[PDB]
Fold Elongator complex protein 2.
Amino acid sequence: ECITPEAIFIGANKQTQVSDIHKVKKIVAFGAGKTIALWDPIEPNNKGVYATLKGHEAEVTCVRFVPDSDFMVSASEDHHVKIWKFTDYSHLQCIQTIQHYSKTIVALSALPSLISVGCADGTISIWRQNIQNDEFGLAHEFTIKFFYPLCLSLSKVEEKKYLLAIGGTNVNVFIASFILSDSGIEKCRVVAELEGHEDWVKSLAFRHQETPGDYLLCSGSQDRYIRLWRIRINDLILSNKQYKFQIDDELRVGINFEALIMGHDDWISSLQWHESRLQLLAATADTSLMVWEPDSGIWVCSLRLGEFWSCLWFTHERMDFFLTNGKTGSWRMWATCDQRLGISGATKDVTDIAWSPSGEYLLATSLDQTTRLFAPWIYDASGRKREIATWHEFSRPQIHGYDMICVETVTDTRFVSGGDEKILRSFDLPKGVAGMLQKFVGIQFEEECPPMEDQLQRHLLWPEVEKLYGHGFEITCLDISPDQKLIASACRSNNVQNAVIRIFSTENWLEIKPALPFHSLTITRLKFSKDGKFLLSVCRDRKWALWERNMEDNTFELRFKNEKPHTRIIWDADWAPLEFGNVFVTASRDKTVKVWRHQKEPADDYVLEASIKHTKAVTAISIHDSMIREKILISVGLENGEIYLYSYTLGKFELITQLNEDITPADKITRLRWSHLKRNGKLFLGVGSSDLSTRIYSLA
């Protein structure tokens, strides 16, 4: 039994400096939710996010690769700073969690052995890495006052000579300098107050390569301008004034205002230097990137590209690449010139997932207010199988202004979705997508590379067929009969009147009276019997019910039930394949997973067969449509994000495996579903979690 992660769809965080790229390994690590996602852009078989670094207990607000080292720094909502170290090459292990701060970490710049940490305490401290150990220790901590850090840059002039540009709630740019003793810091002091800005400095960046050589320092503010300061070392002979000072009885330094670049109209957002050339990258408020360089000798814009959260500047193989994370949490690539393929993912907790009736693609609805379709492309535009069948977002059915709560596929060409809206709509697979899905995913229908972010959010939206009214609350769940002629719906409720089950027709999209009452709270799961003559319901009111189907009028009636199957909310339920038997299992907050089976012997009713308990609540349970050996296959998810694979036979659970902690989500498994399809001798598992990440595993 070999469990292999197939794909990870996570979205970047909305925060300054939440992403960084490794200058050497060319690995971009961005904070996605409470995890640090890793992705290799430059790659043969476009794969995308290949790992989610778990550790932080809050949203990651900053990620930085310490240059010239195997280290990386981080910071989260919980004022914590973590230090990772590359275990192998494309992976990192957390080796230290700094608890010291009780306020937000507003700034963070770190060189090989140091880490400047600006905090909302109004204090900026410098951590210095130990000599024998690998952990950092507070070498020094100070403050300017009224003054608060917003950003700071750390630089290395000479061997033990260091500079630190501090910018914050002060129109000025302070320049602290300290020497590096073997036990930390020595002679630290603010040695220069650079005047020039007419507002708060919110950006700083040093450019120090091959000195004696262009040693610049740029800085932005709450304006539409950027200032560049020239730095001379030992030979530095109205505003042509210099700020001289010296490190020790051996160094002299002279800063000076060189030029002001940003346009009057263009308001700047992000700014960073190039990895090797003397070029500055500045991204405007509106989606537009600009590159600046000298020569004359005046700084000028040498590259513009119109129509940000993050913006990475990197060059590989005599080509320049621009990675730009948008609002939809999607990264896009550009070379210099074409638009290479990027990566997609949610920006808010995922709520539901549902494979196409046949299982070639997987729809995913999240709180991002978007519904995405993920599929694997195993075909070049030439029609031959790709080496590795990678997963991508082939279409974004919608981006409505309603929080996507749930979805279920009616047909490979149509589906239904619901959100924090009163009604729910159905959607039809457009011509544009179908072709795309037929060409790369390979699926026949009746009547040269995946979608870049541009044609994925604008040209690939599914046209709505019909809306359905009835519920006076956001729809929580729903299922489609095996015959696809029915839809069982259920809204959010606190009483019995709204905790009603509505049955809709997929032909006339009209409701089919009468509604179904019983549950006193809100239903969490609705499943139709494999045969289709039954409907099951679990309703976080600690009970379940089975509604028999009248094959004539298609009206349902209550037959079986159980007022106390669980001591706490039931989160999920599922039916085993007919061959196994008239069985269905429920997953509950009471930590247990119970199995039920029809018994007409002592009296007609669905009796309890087996039951197992876990450590955390079981929020997701899905059983495979086919029978593995002569036994059934079940998957279980928890509030931990942990996933258990079980085997089941008349009264005996067999643990196949517990997905390594390194390959599973970081929070509540909102939904788990097996794909109906088997391809390349593998089974597929869809996993939507509360850590805003859609994932896909495979069982060999």
Observations:
- Helices lie at 431-441, 454-457.
- The two ends are 6 Å apart (CA to CA).
